[PDB]
Symmetry: C5
Subunit: 330 residues, 5 copies
């Protein structure tokens, strides 16, 4: 039917003349996974192209598009859009190459693909786990410049669609929108680009329950030593060192759960402040015991004031620190 | 034999006319693995197709189907069914492409494949480990719409078969059934879909033995401190902090075994309630010791009632909590 | 030399007539690895085929087989045997496709391959680590039924060979033998199958040394508390709780080493019985202390009998449990 | 247009004559990851080639370069540069082979590629985590020697470009520069090589906070035992052993975080010196207790001098060690 | 130039006659990694072949070898050497197939490849970590027997070269040499083989520092209990159980670092002997306390001799065990 053998398809339509417009339509299917260590995300989507080529015109009276088996792609001219800043990608081939080709009698062509793309996304972990991340996906032509191929969205803001089943266990996805920008390369010239933007928000309940509660509980447990009688040395001494050991074990367990190795985080600040409080509580009893021993030795030849002042100083200081910490990071 | 070279197979049979019916028969072989972190399952199955094409008719007197070496698939028209919402898939090729082709003299064609499909499945972990999960697999044509290709099960409910060796170590599989639905796409039209549904149930003995028994044992061990004489401070004090440390180690060990990071679970509720009970038991002795010291100091210038009331309050409260917890989640 | 271009190889020899016998010879090279979580094993083997085809006859006077470069496989008819219940497989291609083809002047053909096959194998872990496992590998034709292709071993029991270097670090391999069975499919008919069977036995020294010795040592250490004077409360109390903590740490460490998550095992029974013994030993001293305190309070207004009876009850009970456990599982 | 079918492209231009100059231009896109265990890095870059071939000349009046669909690469002569000391590499093929081809009327050809390369890099971990690492990437022709192909940078130092988004979470990248060297092979001759060099610096805050602070805190906690009265044996004895246990747990936790298994590191020196200090502190109290017991036994038939001297010796020794350690490694 | 189309290359040179000699030259580039669990190593090397074929002769006056683009390999006869006992292998294809072809006017042909080979190697872990391992790589023809193809090293011992950058972080590589052997197969005949041998030695400092030092330190710490006064029961009792717990934690940490699961090792012997010593030290104090209590009870109605004898017995026994252990394993 088509006069494929009568023309050479190694050259774009309108070779040597003005640029050929190409439209893009995208439908996002699902998001597979997000890796924070490698800073990338995986997305599966449908890609569509629109253009006109008079060399594919065939005589017909129905004036309706006809579907071909997709094996003609290797013989006709096809746009070569590629994903920028991508690490790995492939096209599904079960049970065959997922390629759709529709040609109208007047020469309008529709081309579709189903691809999986992995792209990088820089993340900021300063406000972890309260941080908010933004990522984007870029589409650009490889060989043809702006003077030979024009790339634009088919229907503007209506060219992007999202499946209702898109969801993530640890993140909340919202605010899908599209924008365009012009890029420049030193050795080749100017190219057009297409962007797909979205915003990710992290759930806070799990991190709070797993991290902040044990530290506060351990601090309150360490606060108990201020009320036991100072004469019970074999009871006062082991409590502080056991609290230190338990805090060390908690810190060791928390670190192995989530690897970041980037910079300081608010969770580390909280944990180290709690550790410093525990250390000061441990030193306080040693100071009290030394003073009591010196006083008894001097007397030889009532509750101590240090404990009474500590019982007021420590809780107020911890409350002030909590208020400052939850006001700085909101 | 077949007049392959005398016809063009780039167009479907009955091109430009009514839709061509296609039948589907599926036999499930085995299930490989199920991942809860990525929410997907792997399945190996046999796929079969039925259709009629007069272009493949050959003269014969036996009126019986004949088998070909499968190399004719690349030359004749073949349906292009694909699996929806799939992450990765492939066709086995050992020692060759597992493709079967049978053509009857009147033009009836049988086509078979052996594929492995990985598909996503959303899971709810609110009732873990008592939760029950349901998953499904979807089959749909890619290029041809409803007006060009009709997809239906060959024998209705009898078109699905399961191997007797299908089993899972951690899950129980039951209730295989099939259903059909019609789907719509904005930019292409309507398509038919086929569904394969099954239900998964989780075994409870392992989780119970590994999680609930140690917590109850630790709570009962912490309950021992209510009977030791209050004068044995170097014996009463270390017991509570050691119980707290042991509970913390148990919680740390349990968390690393199964990662979910989705939302609150009943196991977390049980563990944190046990931790709160241990913390209250620790604080009770400190309160008793402070009251006893104050009483002795006042007297200077019998079993305490707090222990007697605690010996009754704590076990009854824990029994009530256990009854409520096992009645809410059944 | 061969008249390949003068014949059509899309049809089997003797098309439309009786079945064509095919012989199979197998030589096992090595076993790569065995996974208990996924229940599969990896094997590398040589596969050979024997059949006769008069279309490949060439005139010769030496009456000896000649070797070809293997590129003729894509042009001539080749059997399409596939491995049943396999997960993944491939053919080595370094530095080229490992294919051997030998054709005798009278038309006898030899075909060889070198493949790696991963196949599933159900395992029973009830008697772990004393369990014994059996696995098998299946070979079957895909497209041709029994009425078109007959599959049998070339020399019966002598058709299987094993390399002398086959060994496993954790398993003992023995009793290689072959057997045949006939299989049926509802939608296609009957097919022949070939089986390769072997038996695996697990080494016991490592598991014994790593698991059973620490539990017995901890039980014997907990038994020490029965001889210390009851008046040393700050020495008797911490010992039991420290033993409980050590046993909990040991149980946590053992579980992370080997994941099964299938059902109860004998190791779990042993560990939980040891834990129950430790718990009872802990409760015994609390009961003794309460009774002694009550007796002293009554007296105010010699070794206790409980310890004397426990010193006899506990070791005898543990010995009886050990005898029962090692008699049930042999 | 091009007279591809009129010439044989199995031979290089100017076959049998002088060498054909080839220019190279490289633009680095991003760095994916760096592995210290396997000592390799991953890089994604654009590769460009420049050469002249009169066989591709076509008549034109615009005197401007024209772009082809890239399918002509398989038919024309193309340089075969390969990356030396590479482990794995591939060319992206989504949605098609990322190949650009531009031919001017006079025969000048531009060829571009987009590849991902993994290359080895030896690292020195003696000064970890203060170490500084240097890596390089090598490009060399495979088949053609120096007498047949000349390789050089197109514009010298200006032939290398770097993207502004290149960054690493754990490393700082700086000082990109290029250099050339001549290599020799015994069995083939001489070849030219191209180098891309960069320097990596490691961030120190995370390692300091995670490693050095706990050790100093534990040493200072162990220093507390010098001030408690010597008569409190049940308080002095457990403190040292608990400090030893906590230090052992810290060392165990630190080792599992970062695997090197190469040689001694400064962190190990610091940790073992701290452990030795803790061990000496433990032994000091035992010596003091033995001397006090002997003195009391002799007397039967004031603060001890050992503690007074230790209170001065230990902090000064630790400060001296810290100064020496931070002066040796700067 | 070459008369490729005038000859059939499906048959080896000298078909039906004497064997055709083939030379092999190998240059090792680097070793990637060594896995002890799977018992295999990865190697990257250059492979070269030498043979003569009069069918490739071309008229020339320079009498010098000419280089071709490597695309002629698919059309001419090429040897099919394969690696025996290999698990996986591939040929690098960036930016193209790394194949070199040189043909002299008289018909001498040079063929080169760049491959990565993974091969198994049985290891003995009885003397770990003092063990020494030896591995080898095997090269053999697949289809052609000895009567059709002769395989030998081109220059004997000088046919093997090693890069100066070959190194391993955990192993020392030395003594590269080559040898040949003749192999036999029951169903095909005799074949020649080529071997590449090397020896690996393990570094001892890391294992010593990480394993043997903590055990000796813990034993010496447990030895402290022999000097404290027997009347300090709340100080003597916790020390032994805490030492046992610390030793158990150390053993748990060491095991998770290196998995072998093969047989008993010397490190396990050392650790279990240390554990037995600690257990005996724990039991000694219990025996002493029981004897002292019985003596006091008898008296009612000086240092004990057991401690005095233990202070001599234990260190001498440990020194004797150390001498025996370091003399048996040298
Ligand atoms: C020449 C002609 O009739 N062209 C028709 C056009 O009028 C119609 O709008 C379109 C959509 O159906 O189909 C075509
Ligand atoms: C024309 C003719 O004889 N057709 C036969 C049909 O009658 C029979 O039912 C079928 C099944 O064997 O085979 C064919
Ligand atoms: C016709 C003829 O001579 N055939 C021979 C046969 O006799 C011999 O047994 C066989 C094995 O060498 O080779 C062939
Ligand atoms: C023959 C001729 O006109 N050649 C032109 C040259 O003069 C010009 O410098 C170049 C760059 O545009 O294009 C070409
Ligand atoms: C016929 C002739 O001249 N052959 C020459 C030979 O003499 C020389 O040894 C060799 C190496 O250059 O090259 C060729
Ligand atoms: C389309 O969306 C873009 C980005 O979301 C926005 O800037 C623009 O105003 C929108 N256009 C209309 C017509 O609403
Ligand atoms: C077939 O099965 C479906 C779903 O299981 C059910 O709704 C339907 O009633 C069944 N049909 C018959 C005829 O039993
Ligand atoms: C061959 O082996 C099978 C299975 O091992 C056995 O049943 C059969 O008796 C053997 N045949 C002979 C002839 O020994
Ligand atoms: C170019 O850079 C190299 C290496 O960085 C340097 O040696 C050389 O001097 C530079 N050349 C010029 C002209 O600056
Ligand atoms: C070559 O090396 C082999 C093995 O290393 C050795 O046996 C042989 O003697 C050597 N030959 C010569 C001539 O040195
Ligand atoms: C159940 C979550 C508790 C979080 C407490 C946070 C205290 C700062
Ligand atoms: C052997 C399983 C014991 C489960 C106990 C559960 C108590 C709530
Ligand atoms: C060295 C192995 C000891 C195993 C002891 C088993 C006791 C039941
Ligand atoms: C917050 C980092 C503290 C580092 C202390 C280092 C002491 C040598
Ligand atoms: C720094 C290594 C110490 C090794 C001590 C070994 C004692 C047997
Ligand atoms: N992104 C387009 C392009 C062309 C090129 O040579 N490098 O990048
Ligand atoms: N699922 C069918 C289809 C066609 C298309 O363009 N997108 O999806
Ligand atoms: N195992 C043979 C076969 C054929 C088929 O259609 N399904 O299985
Ligand atoms: N690196 C070039 C080359 C050629 C060869 O045979 N070995 O290396
Ligand atoms: N290693 C050569 C060979 C040939 C065969 O059939 N099996 O092995
Ligand atoms: C940079 C914050 C460090 C806090 C140490 C207590
Ligand atoms: C949301 C449940 C929290 C329980 C804390 C004790
Ligand atoms: C089913 C066995 C449980 C044992 C608990 C002590
Ligand atoms: C080689 C340094 C060892 C240090 C041991 C304290
Ligand atoms: C086989 C050696 C065992 C050692 C147990 C102490």
């Amino acid at each position: 039917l088509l006069r494929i053998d009568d023309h050479d398809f190694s050259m774009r339509p309108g070779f040597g003349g003005p640029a050929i417009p190409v439209g893009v339509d995208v439908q996002v299917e699902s998001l597979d996974s997000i890796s924070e260590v490698d800073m990338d995300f995986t997305m599966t989507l449908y890609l569509r192209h629109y253009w006109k080529d008079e060399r594919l015109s065939f005589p017909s009276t129905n004036n309706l598009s006809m579907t071909f088996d997709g094996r003609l792609v290797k013989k006709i001219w096809v746009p070569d859009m590629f994903f920028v800043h991508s690490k790995r990608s492939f096209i599904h081939d079960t049970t065959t190459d997922n390629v759709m080709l529709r040609v109208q009698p007047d020469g309008k062509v529709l081309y579709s693909l189903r691809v999986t793309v992995t792209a990088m996304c820089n993340m900021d972990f300063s406000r972890f786990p309260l941080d908010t991340q933004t990522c984007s996906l870029e589409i650009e032509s490889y060989a043809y410049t702006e003077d030979d191929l024009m790339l634009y969205w088919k229907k503007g803001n209506d060219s992007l669609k999202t499946d209702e089943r898109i969801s993530l266990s640890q993140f909340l996805i919202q605010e899908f929108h599209t924008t365009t920008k012009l890029a420049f390369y030193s050795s080749t010239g100017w190219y057009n680009r297409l962007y797909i933007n979205f915003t990710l928000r992290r759930h806070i309940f799990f991190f709070l329950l797993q991290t902040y509660f044990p530290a506060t509980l351990m601090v309150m447990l360490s606060w108990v030593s201020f009320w036991i009688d100072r004469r019970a040395v074999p009871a006062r001494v082991p409590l502080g060192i056991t609290t230190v050991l338990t805090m060390s074990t908690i810190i060791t367990g928390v670190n192995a759960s989530m690897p970041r190795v980037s910079y300081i985080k608010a969770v580390d600040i909280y944990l180290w402040v709690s550790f410093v409080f525990v250390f000061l509580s441990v030193l306080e009893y040693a100071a009290v015991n030394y003073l009591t021993t010196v006083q008894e030795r001097k007397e030889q030849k009532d509750t101590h004031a240090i404990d009474k002042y500590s019982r007021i100083i420590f809780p107020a200081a911890y409350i002030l620190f909590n208020l400052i910490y939850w006001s700085i990071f909101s």
